[PDB]
Structures are given as structure tokens and as C-alpha cells.
């Protein structure tokens, strides 16, 4: 086939989802060019698992799921099979048998704001770890102690989402990164 995959809608979306509420778009029966998806910007990364990046090109008879969201720079390592930490534990989890690619790039120029961008959040607390590709958008007060919270923030009773608050002056590990996860 010779009809272009609409990856431009994923990679070049004006705004990205918070990682805890991550987006998913299905891409099917079209052709693409991995060298167009990844442009090798200085502060960017491209990794594949169980596949060659060339397998992104011929999608004429294949379905790809494009998941996308924003994290901070020092969390990009968690967007991989086998990883631990707040993002992989509580926000976006890949299976051990993940077969696909991860593209992440610094978006300080789009997603920071002099006073703080509070539109991007991540889940800081959860009673247990997500399963692969699970998605949780609940905002129930997290009970960190023995006293039950009754929907009221308080001592040992935490609102579960933390805002990144991205500011363009943040250090290298704290700046925002857009992420596209391509899975087969």
C-alpha cells in the first residue's frame, strides 16, 4: 500500500496526555518511515525491544498501538520492559514480553511555562502496581497510614497525583519529555 500512516497526529499533537491518563491511538494499514518518526534531536532517544525499527515502515497488514504522554527526563529509563519506579509502578507499565519501540524527546520548549505548567501530572501513590498496559485515572485519597481517610486530605491521607509543574529553568533530569510507545 502507499497511504501514509497518520503518525503526525500522535508525534506532533499540540498537547500530550498526562502519563497517568496516557493516550492510545491505533495505527493500521498504512506505510510509515521510522526515520521520519525519529529525528535524532540532541536530547532524544529511540529504543526497540524484540523488533527492528524498520518494522515500523510496512504497516499495510499490521496494527500498531501508539501510546503517548509526558514524563520528566530522569524517568525516560522507566519506559521499558523490566523497569521499577513511580512511572513504571503506578502510571504506565510495559509487559516483560513487550515487542515494540519507545521514542522520547525533550519538550522543554513546548511543555514548560515560566510560572509552572500544572497540566501534566503523575500518580505518586497506589495500593499496588499496575499490570502491563493498565490505566488508572482515579483520584481517591490514598491511605498511607492506619486511620481511614474519608475522602479528606490529611495526615497520612494523600491526594494521589503529583503535578510536574514544568518550568523552563528546570535541570536536565527535571525537564519534560514527550514519549511515544509503539507496540505490536
Amino acid at each position, epitope marked *: 500500500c502507499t497511504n501514509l500512516c497518520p503518525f503526525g497526529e500522535v508525534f506532533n499533537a499540540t498537547r500530550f496526555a498526562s502519563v497517568y491518563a496516557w493516550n492510545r491511538k491505533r495505527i493500521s494499514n498504512c506505510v510509515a518511515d521510522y526515520s521520519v518518526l525519529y529525528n*535524532s*534531536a*540532541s*536530547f*532524544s*532517544t*529511540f*529504543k*526497540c*525491544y*524484540g*523488533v*527492528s*525499527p524498520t518494522k515500523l515502515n510496512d504497516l499495510c497488514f499490521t496494527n500498531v498501538y501508539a501510546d503517548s504522554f509526558v514524563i520528566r*527526563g*530522569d524517568e*525516560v*529509563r522507566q519506559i*521499558a*520492559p*523490566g*523497569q521499577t519506579g513511580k512511572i513504571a509502578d503506578y502510571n504506565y507499565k510495559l509487559p516483560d*514480553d*513487550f*515487542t515494540g*519501540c519507545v521514542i522520547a524527546w*525533550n519538550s522543554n520548549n513546548l511543555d514548560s511555562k515560566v510560572g509552572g505548567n500544572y497540566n501534566y501530572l503523575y500518580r505518586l501513590f497506589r495500593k499496588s502496581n499496575l499490570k502491563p498496559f493498565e490505566r488508572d485515572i482515579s483520584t481517591e485519597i490514598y491511605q498511607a497510614g492506619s486511620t481511614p481517610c474519608n475522602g479528606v486530605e490529611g495526615f497520612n491521607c494523600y491526594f494521589p497525583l503529583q503535578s510536574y509543574g514544568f518550568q523552563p529553568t528546570n535541570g*536536565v*533530569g527535571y525537564q519534560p519529555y514527550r514519549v511515544v510507545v509503539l507496540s505490536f
Partner: nanobody
Amino acid sequence: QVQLQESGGGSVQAGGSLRLSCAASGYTFSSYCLGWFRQAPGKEREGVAAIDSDGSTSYADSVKGRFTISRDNAKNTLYLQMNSLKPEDTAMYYCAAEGGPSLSYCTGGYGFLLSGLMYNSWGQGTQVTVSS
């Protein structure tokens, strides 16, 4: 997680040479992205050189023309060859790696590969001391 066992540091006079090596675990080594970092006392860690799974290499400006990063995929070994050493090359040097048992391709841009953001595994560090 990748085990990194590192070796070869030492003392040498200015203008001399020294070679670091790093032995890595795993069965997907040729897919790894690999880097060398260094940290002198009372100054923060700095990316020195990187090589991605395709074999493209990147160098900090201060070592271009003197240091060479290379890899031997058949032996799971990473090297840093250091020539024309200067006193300000004195530092503790670390190999870093991004691996994983299903990792099949691994790269990034210049700034990313020379930062710690790329790597989830670090070697134990070896000392290089350049006497004037």
C-alpha cells in the same frame, strides 16, 4: 540491570596514554548503548564518550581527537583509549550502559547519550591520574 566490571585506570605523565576497559553482562550486548563518564573531586560528573547500537560515536568537545570509544561485541567489552592525557583529565571514570534481555536497538541524540538520562547501569569506577 547489566553488570559492568571496569578496569585499566592508573597514573601516567602528561602526554601519555592509558586504556580503560569494561566487561558487561548479558546476551544482547550488541544492542546496548554504552558510554564513558568521569567525575573529578568537587565538580560534577561529565559525559566523555558514547557509542550506540549502530556504532555511531559521540565525544565531549574536551576529548575530541584524543579519546576513542570502541566496543568488541564478540567479547561484551567496551573500551576507552585515552591519548595525549592532560592533568585536567584526572578523574574517576565510569562505564555506563543501557541494556536489557529483549533490547534490540538503542540510540539517542548527542546530548542525551552524554547525559546520565540514557543509562540504567553503572560500573564501579576506576581512577585515572595525570601527573604534570
